[PDB]
């Protein structure tokens, strides 16, 4: 009975195989068949290639030895190599052209999701080329999806020597019969088979996967589109910045490149961006996913004034100062979306680009009190219920699991009405004691929000809604201004509070505004439609930021 | 009696003044004298420039209004503007050409060091230009050296209106008589003077500084070269990564750009790089200053094996994996320098470039036990004293303040002999009970190391020296390899343990090796010669990494 799946890198998890390049070069340069491939394996287990794969020497040390072997091979079959022939050039292009075989990775992901131990076993080299980062990036993207990465050059062993196979089984802590081993090389498959492992010769991916699903009893082909990679909180780099004596800001950080600051809404967490963090980091960005003031591991002072937009923005500017960041792209959702428009209006020099999910930019009305404005729209009734200190705190803090289960629902799910909340006497008055689990969240993810909210509760989060007059007065100072830096407004079709039509006049204040629209998407944009959020943000980031 | 110094940005802390550009443009384009300057101040306190300085509108909104005023001014003095005339172009160049007036900043730094409250008071704009980052960077570098930054566009007030002066005094919490105010504009100085503040009209910096020192009684001109900017631990972004169930790694992070991983030696801290962190971040790098395993806020497991080079390196690779960094430049000193050569030899794909201070790269001798090798050199006797678990821990942990005061000394100071430490029966046996304070460290900085070492003590740190056999066996696997990635070896003339001559054969294994040499420098390179360390590292980073 199987419980472990092992995959080769070249020709299995990564395509095209860096092996089929010697053949391609021979054909392209009208060279004798197998000429370059012979020079590659010259001397068998004692030759340059075996020493390279065992980690005795590095790739840059192997390059001149492979070149020598290429000449000695051309000498025997009495032929001549083109004057411009370069092994480095051939390998640089081959490695660079080699990409992840996505359906193979999807299959490995699915097997691991069903309780399988997954491993990459590969004959590889110590890459010291000036262009080594390309493959380093590829190994990083691949490895985090597996339990083990066994590299020949790191272990000093090589396929097909049987010591690497016994090493593999020892790291797996499994008997060969419990192991599937996928390889594109027949000779490297053989020792795994003669040990009693289930084996698959990988030519085309589809056939290999049909064999893989027939042998495991798990559907791997024609499976629904998977969700993007999520975050395991304990596997993240956690950052902490003191923005003032009593205020510390917590953030999760992933990636390299331009700084992208993610600002969640109410009542959320850095974890609300779990599906965006790995995707945006993979797209070449330095992701800084915040626990906004009043949330999770960030400080939560009790005072209402501590949560007005002016202080929140100033604190975010200090956060940039302390991290040594002259700018960051600011991406917000809900209350975070509102902060992010105010960062752009008051601190444009600190904002590389501004993006908002669901939250529109609506200039303050200087001829009307904000309380009047909120009352003029039935959907903003929840904001009036949030005004009285302690009332919403008691209801929201009573049963944390019920709070998040009731709040975090997709549009098709029996969502709370944000209409007549004051009259009804609360948010969950017509809601069950034991809400069903939404398809957007697992029980474990709900328990993360529960644990996070146990520290400070809902006072600080609710205080974001308790500065309407203060924020209105501050916003009125910006009435003559326009947002002229790169900006993205993402609308969610089925958000019945932050409705897409509320964003219709934004071009009057943001003329160069770019847009995105997510159909069949509720209020919780990031978890409702993660794939499309990532697609819209990456595309906008690569074009404008 | 003075206790506060206020500085203007334009023409005072920053040069050349963005004002003298309108004059330069007029002269360069043979335009009537004061033509561009008239259009600039058109309408006085009701014109476009006042609205811009008050934050009513942004710089990009002001650009077309300034262009209109430029035409109306040319209309009156019956002249014509060159067909290619662009206000944006003129201002982009002016802002870009404007740099920090270093002697003015040095004076402000010196005043603040003597207990003065320092402030920047400036008439500025909300910069939303596509090239706004340049000035954002300049404001970041300037502001962190001051107690307050008062910007006209943020406060909605402007010089010379007297409300900004009363605002300034309120933020300073000081009576005008306790305030020096430096301005290059006579009109902006006037309200500060008529309030009773000490005032200085700034034309040339030298005269302004002579006036400033005569008035404060503090030497500001012809003063010795200052030390580089240091770190205040509580003002840093602190990062934490779990590299394995029982191991968490702590680091301080500053800057944006390529990742630079700083690896301290024994018995140190991330704080050993206090003078490098702000400098390297300012040079365009993302600084990650580690608390190495066994130190400060990083985990310190008791087992000796937890500190062998193989596990330390693997853990550093996991650190990169968890942060989402495909590469980092690795900069090490002492034990950190040794780790950094092993990162380059075993993980070249993860190392952008490798630099070591004092620690040479010497390939392992496979024909001699490492214990024999250490014994063959009298200077490595301290390593033999460090072998017996508990012996060095007891001596080093007895009086923490004495330990750091005895260890951290410059070459001219009465340093400990690393010779005959076993025979003598310890490191501090011929050392005083109350060592004098070295010129390299303050009492406060000593107390930081003291507090840091109170958590885990010297077991984990000393365990780095207790894996000689294990490290030798691992190093022997790399004997066929060469270091072919960018590498820097920095030698310290007066390090009597890690002597510069021990590095003489390094080109045999690192052929493209680049070098640096610090004269009159002891073992504690970073704090002994901070200015020259920064100069060597920045120059090497900008050229090779
Ligand atoms: Br809280 C909150 C704010 C905005 C929209 C919402 N939609 C559904 C449930 C809760 C919501
Ligand atoms: Br601990 C140590 C290691 C290496 C060199 C040293 N020099 C002076 C004082 C202590 C030292």
From Swiss-Prot, chains A, B:
GO terms for cellular component: cytosol; extracellular exosome; peroxisomal matrix; peroxisome. A lipid is attached at residue 521 (S-(15-deoxy-Delta12,14-prostaglandin J2-9-yl)cysteine). Inhibited by 1-(1-acetylpiperidin-4-yl)-3-(4-(trifl uoromethoxy)phenyl)urea (TPAU), 1-cyclohexyl-3-dodecylurea (CDU), 12-(3-adamantan-1-yl-ureido)-dodecanoic acid (AUDA), 1-((3S, 5S, 7S)-adamantan-1-yl)-3-(5-(2-(2-ethoxyethoxy) ethoxy)pentyl)urea (AEPU), N-adamantyl-N[']-cyclohexyl urea (ACU), 4-(((1S, 4S)-4-(3-((3S, 5S, 7S)-adamantan-1-yl) ureido)cyclohexyl)oxy)benzoic acid (c-AUCB), 4-(((1R, 4R)-4-(3-((3S, 5S, 7S)-adamantan-1-yl)ureido)cyclohexyl)oxy)benzoic acid (t-AUCB), 4-(((1R, 4R)-4-(3-(4(trifluoromethoxy)phenyl)ureido)cyclohexyl)oxy)benzoic acid (t-TAUCB) and to a lesser extent by 8-(3-((3S, 5S, 7S)-adamantan-1-yl)ureido) octanoic acid (AUOA). Keywords: Acetylation, Aromatic hydrocarbons catabolism, Cytoplasm, Detoxification, Hydrolase, Lipid metabolism, Lipoprotein, Magnesium, Metal-binding, Multifunctional enzyme, Peroxisome, Phosphoprotein. Substrate binds at residue 382. It holds the Pfam family Abhydrolase_1. The modification Phosphoserine is found at residue 369. Changing residue 153 to Y: Decreased phosphatase activity; no effect on epoxyde hydrolase activity. It catalyses: an epoxide + H2O = an ethanediol; (9S,10S)-10-hydroxy-9-(phosphooxy)octadecanoate + H2O = (9S,10S)-9,10-dihydroxyoctadecanoate + phosphate; 12-phosphooxy-(9Z)-octadecenoate + H2O = 12-hydroxy-(9Z)-octadecenoate + phosphate; 12-phosphooxy-(9E)-octadecenoate + H2O = 12-hydroxy-(9E)-octadecenoate + phosphate. The modification N6-succinyllysine is found at residues 54, 420, 454. The modification N6-acetyllysine is found at residues 42, 190, 214. Residues 1-223 are annotated as: Phosphatase. Phosphate binds at residues 122-123. The keyword Glycosyltransferase does not apply. It comes from the Eukaryota. The active site is at residues 334, 465, 523. The keyword Metal-binding applies. It is an enzyme of class 3 (hydrolase). It is found in: Cytoplasm; Peroxisome. GO terms for molecular function: 10-hydroxy-9-(phosphonooxy)octadecanoate phosphatase activity; epoxide hydrolase activity; lipid phosphatase activity; lysophosphatidic acid phosphatase activity; magnesium ion binding; phosphatase activity; protein homodimerization activity; toxic substance binding. Residues 234-545 are annotated as: Epoxide hydrolase. Changing residue 54 to R: Decreased phosphatase activity; no effect on epoxyde hydrolase activity. Homodimer. The N-terminal domain has phosphatase activity. The C-terminal domain has epoxide hydrolase activity. Bifunctional enzyme. The C-terminal domain has epoxide hydrolase activity and acts on epoxides (alkene oxides, oxiranes) and arene oxides. Plays a role in xenobiotic metabolism by degrading potentially toxic epoxides. Also determines steady-state levels of physiological mediators. This is Bifunctional epoxide hydrolase 2. It comes from Homo sapiens (Human).
């Amino acid at each position: 009975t199987l419980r472990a799946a092992v995959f080769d890198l070249d020709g299995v998890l990564a395509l095209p195989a860096v092996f089929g390049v010697l053949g391609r070069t021979e054909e392209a340069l009208a060279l004798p068949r197998g000429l370059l491939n012979d020079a590659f394996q010259k001397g068998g287990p004692e030759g340059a290639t075996t020493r390279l794969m065992k980690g005795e020497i590095t790739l840059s040390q192997w390059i001149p030895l492979m070149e020598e072997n290429c000449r000695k091979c051309s000498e025997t079959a009495k032929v001549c190599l083109p004057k411009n022939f370069s092994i480095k050039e051939i390998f640089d292009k081959a490695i660079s052209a080699r990409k992840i075989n996505r359906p193979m990775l999807q299959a490995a992901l699915m097997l691991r999701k069903k309780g399988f131990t997954t491993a990459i076993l590969t004959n590889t080299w110590l890459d010291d080329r000036a262009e080594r980062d390309g493959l380093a990036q590829l190994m990083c993207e691949l490895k985090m999806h597996f339990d083990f990465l066994i590299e020949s050059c790191q272990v000093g062993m090589v396929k097909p020597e049987p010591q690497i196979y016994k090493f593999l089984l020892d790291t797996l802590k499994a008997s060969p019969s419990e192991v599937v081993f996928l390889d594109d090389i027949g000779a490297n498959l053989k020792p795994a088979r003669d040990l009693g492992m289930v084996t698959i010769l990988v030519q085309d991916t589809d056939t290999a996967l049909k064999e893989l699903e027939k042998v495991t009893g798990i559907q791997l082909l024609n499976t629904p589109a998977p969700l993007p990679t999520s975050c395991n909180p304990s596997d993240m780099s956690h950052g902490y910045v003191t923005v003032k004596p009593r205020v510390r800001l917590h953030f999760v950080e992933l990636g390299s490149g331009p700084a992208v600051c993610l600002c969640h809404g109410f009542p959320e967490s850095w974890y609300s961006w779990r599906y965006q963090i790995p995707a945006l980091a993979q797209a070449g960005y330095r992701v800084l996913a915040m626990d906004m003031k009043g949330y999770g591991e960030s400080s939560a002072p009790p005072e209402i004034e501590e949560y007005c937009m002016e202080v929140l923005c100033k604190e975010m500017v200090t956060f940039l100062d302390k991290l040594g960041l002259s700018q960051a792209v600011f991406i917000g959702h809900d209350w975070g979306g509102m902060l992010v428009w105010y960062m752009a209006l008051f601190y444009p020099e600190r904002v590389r680009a501004v993006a908002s999910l669901n939250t529109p930019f609506i200039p303050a009305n200087p001829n009307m009190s904000p309380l009047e404005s909120i009352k003029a729209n039935p959907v903003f009734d929840y904001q009036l219920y949030f005004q009285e200190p302690g009332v919403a705190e008691a209801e929201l803090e009573q049963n944390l699991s019920r709070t998040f289960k009731s709040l975090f629902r997709a549009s098709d799910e029996s969502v709370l009405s944000m209409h007549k909340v004051c009259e009804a006497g609360g948010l969950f008055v017509n809601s069950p004691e034991e809400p069903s689990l939404s398809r957007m969240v697992t029980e474990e993810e709900i328990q993360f929000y529960v644990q996070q909210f146990k520290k400070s509760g809902f006072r600080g989060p609710l205080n974001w809604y308790r500065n309407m007059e203060r924020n209105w007065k501050w916003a009125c100072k910006s009435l003559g201004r326009k947002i002229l830096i790169p900006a993205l407004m993402v609308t969610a079709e089925k958000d019945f509070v932050l409705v897409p039509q509320m964003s219709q006049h934004m071009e009057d204040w943001i003329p160069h505004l770019k847009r995105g629209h997510i159909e069949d998407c509720g209020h919780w944009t990031q978890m409702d439609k993660p794939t499309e959020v990532n697609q819209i943000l990456i595309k906008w980031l690569d074009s404008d930021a």
